[PDB]
Write an enzyme that holds these catalytic residues in place. Structure first.
Site, PDB file in Angstrom:
ATOM      1  N   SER A 130       0.832  -1.203   0.000  1.00 31.27           N
ATOM      2  CA  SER A 130       0.000   0.000   0.000  1.00 31.27           C
ATOM      3  C   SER A 130       0.869   1.257   0.000  1.00 31.27           C
ATOM      4  CB  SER A 130      -0.965  -0.026   1.186  1.00 31.27           C
ATOM      5  OG  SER A 130      -2.039   0.888   0.974  1.00 31.27           O
ATOM      6  N   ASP A 176      -9.477  -3.719  -5.710  1.00 32.20           N
ATOM      7  CA  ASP A 176      -8.951  -2.771  -4.739  1.00 32.20           C
ATOM      8  C   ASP A 176      -9.803  -1.507  -4.710  1.00 32.20           C
ATOM      9  OD1 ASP A 176      -7.332  -1.123  -3.143  1.00 32.20           O
ATOM     10  OD2 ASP A 176      -5.514  -2.152  -3.822  1.00 32.20           O
ATOM     11  N   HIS A 208      -7.765  -4.957  -1.447  1.00 31.44           N
ATOM     12  CA  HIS A 208      -6.525  -4.293  -1.056  1.00 31.44           C
ATOM     13  C   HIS A 208      -5.717  -5.100  -0.044  1.00 31.44           C
ATOM     14  CE1 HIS A 208      -3.926  -0.802  -0.736  1.00 31.44           C
ATOM     15  NE2 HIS A 208      -4.060  -0.786   0.579  1.00 31.44           N
TER      16      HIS A 208
END
Ligand SMILES: [Ca+2]
Length: 262
Positions: A130, A176, A208
């Protein structure tokens, strides 16, 4: 004649297994003891040799537990790996890039001799989830000495990564909602130069948070990428080129690369 090869000849099943062929030990880095990052855990193969070193960053509000399984698994294929905590859980991508660099420096200089004796300090790689994957892209774009970079479902406001010269595998998640592949992973990959070794692997039916639990596909291709570019281990090219199957009955939603690699 490749001095960096480690471990037996690979297979699909060996890379999909929950452990590689090396037993692993750990060394802790406390928050106070770590200059420039929030501490972490170093995983290292017990078998006497030198190995490439990898630093892995989590994402926004994330801790090292969110990437721990992957750090340990990579180490069990013959790497020294630190999974870090960040200075604060709200650090942005460019800050995480500085902490990734601090973590590599810690392993080389300040860890114990058990760790330092097992590190080839000239062969370093970075990874992150991320905002940590955004930090991975940022550091790679500043550090052509790095041998490999693996952003996992990366998040970053900068979409132009044309200055990256490090062999880079981007892993995206098709569903995501936090770092949508439309506006993060895919533009990042598209802006990487075509002259470099690079690949884009989009997981099928993944959120995600797919990187935060054990995932055979992320494990397999992360290890194959690190083997191929940190160790220059051409026994692992077979998994990257042409790479995973691209549809019905396949492993992934999409796979792109610059195969063949130089
Ligand atoms: Ca600290």
């Amino acid at each position: 004649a490749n001095p960096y090869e480690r471990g037996p000849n690979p297979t699909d099943a060996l890379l999909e297994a929950s452990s590689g062929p090396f037993s692993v030990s750990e060394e802790n880095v406390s928050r106070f003891g770590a200059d420039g990052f929030g501490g972490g855990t170093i995983y290292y193969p017990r078998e006497n040799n030198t190995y490439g070193a990898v630093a892995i960053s989590p994402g926004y509000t994330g801790t090292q537990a969110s990437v721990a399984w992957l750090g340990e698994r990579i180490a069990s294929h013959g790497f020294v790996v630190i999974t870090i905590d960040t200075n604060t859980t709200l650090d942005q991508p460019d800050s995480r890039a500085r902490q990734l660099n601090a973590a590599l420096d810690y392993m080389i200089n300040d860890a114990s001799s058990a760790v330092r004796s097992r590190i080839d300090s000239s062969r370093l790689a970075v990874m992150g989830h991320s905002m940590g994957g955004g930090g991975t892209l940022r550091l790679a774009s500043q550090r052509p000495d790095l041998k490999a970079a693996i952003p996992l479902t990366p998040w970053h406001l900068n979409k132009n990564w044309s200055s990256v010269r490090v062999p880079t595998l981007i892993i995206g998640a098709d569903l995501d909602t936090i770092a949508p592949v439309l506006t993060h992973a895919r533009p990042f990959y598209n802006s990487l130069p075509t002259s470099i070794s690079k690949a884009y692997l989009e997981l099928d039916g993944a959120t995600h948070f797919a990187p935060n639990i054990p995932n055979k596909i992320i494990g397999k291709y992360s290890v194959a990428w690190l083997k191929r570019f940190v160790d220059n281990d051409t026994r692992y090219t077979q998994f990257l080129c042409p790479g995973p199957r691209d549809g019905l009955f396949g492993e992934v939603e999409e796979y792109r690369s610059t195969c063949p690699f130089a």
